[PDB]
RNA sequence: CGACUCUCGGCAACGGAUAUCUCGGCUCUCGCAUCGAUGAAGAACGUAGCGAAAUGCGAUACCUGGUGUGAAUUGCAGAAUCCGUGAACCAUCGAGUCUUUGAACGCAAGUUGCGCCCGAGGGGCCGAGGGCACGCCUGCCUGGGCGUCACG
């Protein structure tokens, strides 16, 4: 499989991938943006804190109508942030896959950082909703593809 | 320096255009003349070692028989067959079978409902199997009426 980015150090890097994951694309894009050059161990602790409501995820685009918390005040002075648990758990699973792929290669888990993370839109799935005056409207999910490369340096 | 918005490029997405095809369609021309009470067209239900549909067939049920060809069928498995009266999800057709219906015909019908007759075969009982609609034609049998007569 070809990712959108080459490792540039293919021997010293590990990758993980997920297609058509049933999690909101807009929520996962912000989660992926919050850990762009993060070290692997700090990324895991950050995502567990998000799961535990101790650290918020900053919502910069796709942010209209998002509350303000003060847990996100650093690196987002307006309080716009949230705690997307499903999008955090899905990324955590990918981080554990790439981590074990690195262990097979023998790269040390320490000094590993996310050199590439990407969320792309999957094909949408169809459901239905009913409206007043006998009308039917779409009721759609927005799944995503997630790509992840860990690198030593 | 960063976020946001806009923009340019590279890669990845989304989507199914374009290109090349085509056991289909459309148009034209030719030949032939063959449905049914000997039950048609249509409808239903069944039928395979594994099938729902389509295709095929009818309790002989993806087939029996004859002829032809001549070694397959296959998705899986088991059987049969090979210098042979002999394989085939083969071709073809003269021999057969052909459930419930339907013009549909004992009477009906949102009913597998309600009758009558004959009868192999084992007085009566049990029978397998089969009959019993309407209109009409020729002939036939049994009849009706002083309608027209004849003789008693
Ligand atoms: K709000
Ligand atoms: K672009
Ligand atoms: K085309
Ligand atoms: K009745
Ligand atoms: Mg509101
Ligand atoms: Mg409603
Ligand atoms: Mg209504
Ligand atoms: Mg067939
Ligand atoms: Mg009838």
Ligand 2 centroid, distance to A51 Cα (angstroms): 33
In angstroms, the CA A97 to CA A152 distance is 16
- ∠ CA A46-A15-A121, nearest 5°, is 75
In angstroms, the CA A122 to CA A48 distance is 26
Closest CA to A146 of A102, A86, A106: A86
| String of DSSP letters for chain A | ---SS--SSGGGEEEEEEEEESS-HHHHHHHHHHSSS-BHHHHHHHHHHHHTTSSPEE--SS-TT--B-STT-TT-SS-BEE--HHHHHHHHHHHHHHHHHHHHHT--STT-EEEEEEEEEPPPEEEEEEETTTEEEEEEE--EEEEEEEE--
Nucleotide nearest to A76 (CA to C1'): B3
The residues with which A148 forms a beta bridge, in sequence order, are A16, A117
Question: Do the annotations mark residue A3 as ligand-binding?
Answer: no
Nucleotide nearest to A63 (CA to C1'): B4
Query: Distance of CA A106 to CAs A9, A11, A101, A102, Å?
Result: 14, 10, 9, 6
CA at A72, C1' at B4: how many angstroms apart?
17
In angstroms, the CA A74 to CA A70 distance is 8
**For residue A20, what are its two tokens?**
């058509």
Buried b (16+ CB within 10 A) or exposed e, A77-86: eeebbbbbee
Q: What is the experimental method?
A: cryo-EM
Q: Does the C-beta of A125 come within 7 A of strand B?
A: no
Tell me if A129 sits within 8 A of A139, measured CB to CB.
yes
Tell me if A141 sits within 8 A of A16, measured CB to CB.
no
Ligand 6 centroid, distance to A121 Cα (angstroms): 27
């Amino acid at each position: 499989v070809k990712y959108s980015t080459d490792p540039a150090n293919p021997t010293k890097s590990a990758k993980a991938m997920g297609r058509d994951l049933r999690v909101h694309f807009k929520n996962t894009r912000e989660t992926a943006f919050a850990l762009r050059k993060m070290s692997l161990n700090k990324a895991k602790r950050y995502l567990e804190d998000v799961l535990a409501h101790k650290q918020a995820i900053p919502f910069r685009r796709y942010c209209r109508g998002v509350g303000r918390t003060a847990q996100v005040k650093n690196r987002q002075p307006n309080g716009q942030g949230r705690w997307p648990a499903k999008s955090a758990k899905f990324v955590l699973d990918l981080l554990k896959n790439a981590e074990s792929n690195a262990e097979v290669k023998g790269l040390d888990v320490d000094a590993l950082y996310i050199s590439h993370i990407q969320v792309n839109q999957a094909q949408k799935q169809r459901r239905r909703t009913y409206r007043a005056h006998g009308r039917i409207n779409p009721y759609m999910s927005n799944p995503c593809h997630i790509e992840l490369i860990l690198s030593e340096k």
